[PDB]
Amino acid sequence: MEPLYDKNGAVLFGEPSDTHPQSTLKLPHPRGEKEVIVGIRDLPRKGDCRTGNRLGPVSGLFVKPGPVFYQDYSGPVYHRAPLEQFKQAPMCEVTKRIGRVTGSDGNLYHMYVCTDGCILVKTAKREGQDVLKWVYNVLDSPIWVTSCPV
Ligand SMILES: [Cl-]
Ligand SMILES: [O-]
Hints:
The protein has one helix spanning 48-51, and strands at residues 36-38, 60-64, 68-72, 86-88, 94-102, 108-114, 119-123, 131-134, 143-147. It is mainly beta. Strand 2 and strand 3 (68-72) form a beta hairpin. The protein starts with 35 loop residues before the first strand and ends with a strand. Bound molecules: chloride ion and hydroxide ion (OH). Chloride ion (CL) is lined by residues 1-2, 82, 84-85. Chloride ion binds at residues 1-2, 82, 84-85.
């Protein structure tokens, strides 16, 4: 299975991998001051990275099925979408674009939230095009979707 990472970027099992250079996740980057859940209509907004906001600190954006969004998180996360837990699916109607995430296969994916609450990824590539939803979450851990810029 795809490895999890701790808040100092150390892998908790398996072997570590680098994120795609064009992902909205850029490492190394610190996180884990506080676990902070956010509503999707209340995602962290420009300048929140430096200062935090009324909800707490901001290390970027994390998400897991539910959907549950977080603006900071301290426990194990995915640095890449664990594609064994995703299933090929039709393009949904999307509520929001949330980032560009590295897949388990090393490829770049656009990540969206669908109106049905599903987290969906679609290959960034022009040729070869997969569309998937995050349907199992066996270790109950979010993907780190985007990191704050500094
Ligand atoms: Cl997995
Ligand atoms: O920001």
